[PDB]
């Protein structure tokens, strides 16, 4: 029964390591670390409950350790075991939790993986912009095709009577000019439609590439996370 031999004791540890270790763990996880103030060893326990971590401070007065008055507990380990084997609702019913799981004790890859992560992020953010631009271009082409079609429809609706009168009069050069204009318009429409189809095919290929790139990013990120965790464990 000593502070150093205690498994929950962790010494002077900042919140970053505490909150990194208190992840991917079940409810009811605890560890004890030295108080940040560093005065006559106040110490501090952690208590995860409902996701949130609650920070407990062990008061010490007149050679005696306890959460609060009344002060009737001799050592820190005594109180820690007492509330490990008994619920914390005796004083404050809100906590009403049992200590079950303790925190038990137990290079170019990181830089490389961060490099590909950054390059994939840059490629992704450029590809998203170019995809948006291509989508806008395709929408513009569709809108202008619709506008041309409706203009042709209203032109025919407005000029059908005059066309019929001219063709019934006996004129032929008007028929030839109408045929020429109709052929030119049909060729232009066919060219625009073919261009739109090719652009749609290119957009499909580029969207497939975008999907593959994001899948690569999401597959690679966990490896970088694990490598960073390993490096942090080894160094600090």
């Amino acid at each position: 029964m000593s502070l150093q031999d205690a498994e929950w004791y962790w010494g002077d540890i900042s919140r970053e390591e505490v909150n990194e270790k208190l992840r991917d763990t079940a409810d009811g996880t605890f560890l004890v670390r030295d108080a940040s103030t560093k005065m006559h060893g106040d110490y501090t326990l952690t208590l995860r409950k409902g996701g949130n971590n609650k920070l407990i401070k062990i008061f010490h007065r007149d050679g005696k350790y306890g959460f609060s008055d009344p002060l009737t507990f001799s050592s820190v380990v005594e109180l820690i075991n007492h509330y490990r084997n008994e619920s914390l609702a005796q004083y404050n019913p809100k906590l009403d939790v049992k200590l079950l799981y303790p925190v038990s004790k137990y290079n170019t890859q990181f830089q490389e993986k961060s490099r590909e992560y950054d390059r994939l992020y840059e490629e992704y953010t450029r590809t998203s912009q170019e995809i948006q631009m291509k989508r806008t271009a395709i929408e513009a082409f569709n809108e202008t095709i619709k506008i041309f079609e409706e203009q042709c429809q209203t032109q025919e609706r407005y000029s059908k009577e005059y066309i019929e009168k001219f063709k019934r009069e006996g004129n032929e050069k008007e028929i030839q000019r109408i045929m020429h204009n109709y052929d030119k318009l049909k060729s232009r429409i066919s060219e625009i439609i073919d261009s739109r189809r090719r652009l749609e095919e290119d957009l499909k290929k580029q969207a497939a590439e975008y999907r593959e790139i994001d899948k690569r990013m999401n597959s690679i990120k966990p490896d970088l996370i694990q490598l960073r965790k390993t490096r942090d464990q080894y160094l600090m």
Binding site: E16, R23, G51, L55, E143, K215, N218, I225, R228
Partner: protein
């Protein structure tokens, strides 16, 4: 084209195309029924998928931004202004009229009301109202100079020069610095009841003096007083400035004129959500074998209940149709609860996507029905499984992973209770710890003992208002009684300082009433100068909000249409991040509202945008340099416009041969514009700006912001360690403008073209009585900048980043990073090259009283910053969701409290400071205290 005929240099003005069309119509039949040409309008489709007409004769066909060569013949000002707006925001406007989301259209209808009141107040006191608008005063935060450092003034008076241009007489007069410009003009009349209120523009830039207040508190006059320069002013009359603006008015757009109780507390059920399926998740099948979906009812960073997870399934087909029960009652839900969800993968713990679904809507109606939402990509470097601090709402992009959900059916009306039931809930049914926690930084640890003392003695917390951000992290938001009590507390909570309140708008206080109180305190107590200083943060807090409408835009848009400088910077801060699709819709709608209600100034922005557009294109071809840039397009475009760095700097006629570009790895544009002022001689012959492309500048903007804050604090306390917080502004995606200061040289150039080289140069720059002043100013600048660079942990720097002025000031540029990049507190290292200068050439340094004064002044500056570090903590907290990889989460703000040693005491922080700088210099520190 009524006849429907089509015929296919021609990039001239539209008059040529009109003449060609008339010739063709005269050469072909079917034109007999055509009406007058004035009754027909040319309309076509532009490059932005918009049907638009063309009335602009100044700009030819090539400036219409057409994508295909076709034209059709069919109020006018309304869609003219719509096209101008579309240009001023860079993306089509009418494309938003096709959005099927009712929130978008509701916001578009509602924001025009705010625009209406803003422009009405802008035209409240004509003709002076928009006069004060167009050129707003650039005042200082402190209305009054400090009472103990006015001794820089000769007998408490300042000499100024007033110029009259006749086409050039100067008048030098001494006046008290606490005197209004009325007496300035009154005695300007002499030496050569008359209540003259004419404008006094700063010679060479468009700063104007309008307030009925003393002359010293302006950001230009104060700089002249502190720097010892001669303040030069030139006099116009009111008529010229009034005739400069030809007046504009706002018009309502097309969609403007178009026109007991049951609550959520009476349901006894559980929050159970049916996760049906994900349409497609972009995860490899064989590579990753175990995937699931994590969902949490978050409120801030707090999971109100344990994040309930789904079962793990093979990646073949993610269909569940599974009810998941969350350990949380429905009536205990808070108003701002957020279903933060994410597809995640486990191997044997990293997310694959993320997203947020509001548990309510802007109509305060609980989510209910069949609901399919797309998901955002994982943010860069975010290790956390969820993203409670991420953007809210739907994903406008369609080709993204989409999840299908079903929500509980109640066959009733769901509505969060009105404030009335809580208001009339009643009538029918020592302080040491408080002070210690209040004074402690917001990022600090908190314990349930003091949390319970806060909740129990909440009634005693009203006497100490600064404790308000401490209660919120203490209470459990998943309890209707406690949350109702907290709402009652917030309702009558006294207002706090515009920095403590500005803390209540972080990514950790999502309650609508909490953020409403924070925004109300901001609009009540934040000052136009302070708003100008903190506008970056006030724009960065838009992304945290849940709905398109909120009290935050109601304030930002009202202010940005009352102050033209604040509005101009609001415009550029919004437009600088259109590329990020996350808030593209929200900020584009806000941009459309601004560009509709900005007024005539719109076209100015267009010019500015146009110029930058050209530069963005010009900087694009930079990856034998002047001959290529010779087309008259950019001479016609890159002149006669206000700079984004200042709405008062007319970037006039360009001197193409003068502007030259060096390598410096990346290639910015060192561009010099002549000043078109009639007497720009006194201030600057020139105006040089560095146009940077390819590098981000938001962190540099923040660095200069906090540097100016520190310098102002130092000036306020009594330490004349004057800094050089110059101007900088990013205008888009990794592109922006940087000012260049007058008469400054980098240390590396001095060493190369000139080891006592720096000392020899400072000696040969000046002789006599103006020497000791140079050494004193160099001492002050070096001390201030050393304290600054230690506190903020600015990264590796060389001699190049350091420059020295002629008068004596030293300053720094090129902040690559700050607050460290994680995977060496002060690795900058102060070389002895400056130590010989501070010692006035003596080899010994310990036996120099000057070095002792330098050390003690450094200590005083450090201990001055450490007692105001709370403001910096809040400033760093606000911009967390701003996208910088070095400002993601709160764990990166500890570098502020670690180096400032907020955990320790004042003396312990002192020895920590000396120990750090002793380890930095391999000796020479940790001397006797005081």
């Amino acid at each position: 084209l009524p006849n429907g005929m089509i015929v296919t240099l021609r990039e001239a003005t539209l008059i040529t195309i009109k003449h060609e069309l008339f010739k063709e119509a005269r050469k072909y039949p079917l034109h007999q029924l055509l009406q007058d040409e004035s009754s027909y309008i040319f309309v076509s489709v532009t490059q932005e998928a918009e049907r638009e007409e063309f009335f602009d004769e100044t700009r030819r066909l090539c400036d219409l931004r057409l994508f295909q060569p076709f034209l059709k013949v069919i109020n006018r000002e309304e869609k003219i202004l719509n096209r101008e707006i579309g240009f001023a925001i860079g993306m089509p406007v009418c494309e938003f009229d096709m959005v099927k989301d009712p929130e978008v259209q509701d916001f578009r209808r509602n924001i025009l009301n705010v625009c209406k009141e803003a422009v009405d107040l802008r035209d409240l006191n004509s003709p002076h109202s928009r006069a004060m608008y167009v050129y707003p005063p650039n005042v200082e935060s402190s209305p009054e100079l400090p009472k103990h450092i006015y001794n820089k003034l000769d007998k408490g008076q300042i000499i100024v020069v007033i110029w009259v241009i006749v086409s050039k007489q100067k008048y030098t007069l001494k006046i008290n610095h606490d005197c209004v410009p009325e007496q300035v003009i009154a005695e300007a009349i002499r030496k050569k009841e008359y209540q003259g209120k004419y404008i006094l523009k700063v010679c060479g830039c468009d700063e104007y003096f309008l307030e009925k207040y003393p002359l010293s508190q302006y950001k230009y006059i104060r700089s002249c007083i502190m720097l010892g320069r001669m303040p030069n002013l030139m006099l116009m009359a009111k008529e010229s400035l009034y005739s400069q603006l030809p007046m504009d008015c706002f018009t309502m757009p097309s969609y403007s004129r178009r026109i007991s109780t049951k609550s959520l507390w009476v349901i006894n059920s559980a929050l159970r959500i049916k996760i049906l399926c994900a349409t497609y998740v972009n995860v490899n099948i064989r590579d990753i074998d175990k995937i699931y979906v994590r969902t949490g009812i978050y409120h801030g960073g707090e999971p109100l209940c344990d994040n309930v997870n789904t079962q793990r399934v093979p990646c073949s087909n993610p269909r569940w149709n599974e009810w998941l029960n969350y350990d949380i009652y429905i009536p205990d839900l808070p108003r701002a609860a957020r279903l933060c969800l994410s597809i995640c993968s486990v191997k044997g713990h990293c997310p694959l996507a993320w997203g947020n679904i509001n548990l309510f809507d802007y109509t305060d109606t609980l989510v209910s029905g069949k609901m399919a939402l797309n998901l955002w990509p994982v943010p860069h470097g975010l290790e956390d499984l969820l993203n409670p601090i991420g953007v809210t709402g739907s994903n406008p992009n369609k080709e993204t992973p989409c999840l299908e959900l079903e929500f509980d059916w109640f066959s009733s009306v769901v509505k969060f209770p009105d404030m009335s039931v809580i208001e009339e809930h009643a009538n029918w049914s020592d302080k040491e710890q408080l002070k210690a926690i209040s004074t402690r930084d917001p990022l600090s640890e908190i314990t349930e003992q003091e949390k319970d003392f806060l909740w129990s003695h909440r009634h005693y917390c009203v006497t100490i208002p600064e404790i308000l951000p401490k209660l919120l992290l203490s209470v459990k938001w998943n309890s209707r009684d406690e949350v109702a009590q907290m709402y009652c507390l917030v309702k009558d909570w006294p207002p706090i300082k515009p920095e403590q309140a500005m803390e209540l708008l972080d990514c950790n206080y999502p309650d609508p009433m909490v953020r409403g109180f924070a925004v109300r305190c901001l609009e009540k107590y934040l000052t136009d100068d302070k708003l100008s200083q903190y506008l970056i943060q006030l724009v960065q807090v838009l992304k945290y909000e849940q709905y398109l409408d909120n009290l935050l835009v109601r304030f930002l848009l009202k202010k940005a249409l009352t102050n033209q400088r604040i509005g101009h910077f609001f415009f550029w801060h919004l437009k600088s991040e259109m590329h990020n699709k996350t808030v593209s819709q929200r900020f584009g709608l806000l941009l459309e509202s601004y560009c509709r209600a900005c007024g005539m100034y719109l076209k100015h922005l267009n010019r500015q945008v146009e110029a930058m557009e050209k530069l963005i294109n010009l900087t694009d071809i930079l990856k034998f340099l002047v001959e290529q840039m010779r087309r008259p397009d950019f001479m016609d475009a890159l002149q006669g416009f206000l700079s984004p760095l200042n709405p008062a700097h007319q970037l006039g006629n360009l001197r193409l041969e003068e502007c030259r570009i060096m390598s410096s790895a990346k290639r910015p544009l060192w561009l010099n514009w002549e000043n078109p002022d009639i007497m720009s001689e006194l201030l600057f012959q020139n105006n040089e700006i560095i146009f940077k492309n390819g590098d981000d500048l938001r962190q540099d903007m923040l660095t200069l912001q906090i540097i100016r804050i520190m310098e102002n604090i130092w000036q306020n306390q009594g330490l004349d360690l004057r800094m050089l917080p110059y101007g900088c502004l990013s205008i888009g995606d990794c592109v922006g403008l940087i000012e260049v200061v007058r008469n400054s040289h980098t240390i590396m150039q001095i060493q190369c073209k000139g080891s006592h080289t720096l000392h020899q140069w400072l000696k040969d720059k000046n002789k006599g009585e103006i020497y000791d002043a140079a050494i004193d100013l160099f001492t002050r600048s070096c001390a201030g900048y050393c304290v600054a660079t230690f506190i903020l942990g600015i990264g590796d720097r060389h001699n190049s980043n350091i420059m020295v002025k002629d008068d004596g000031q030293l300053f720094h540029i090129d902040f690559g990073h700050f607050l460290d990049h994680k995977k060496e507190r002060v690795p900058f290292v102060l070389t002895q090259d400056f130590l010989i200068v501070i010692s006035k050439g003596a080899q010994e340094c310990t036996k120099t009283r000057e070095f002792e004064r330098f050390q003690e002044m450094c200590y005083k500056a450090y201990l001055a910053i450490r007692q105001h570090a709370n403001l910096f903590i809040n400033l760093f907290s606000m911009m967390l969701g701003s996208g910088m990889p070095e400002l993601q989460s709160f764990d990166d703000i500890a570098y502020i409290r670690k180096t400032l040693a907020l955990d320790k005491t004042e003396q312990e922080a002192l020895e920590y400071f000396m120990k750090q700088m002793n380890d930095a210099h391999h000796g020479g520190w940790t001397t006797k205290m005081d």
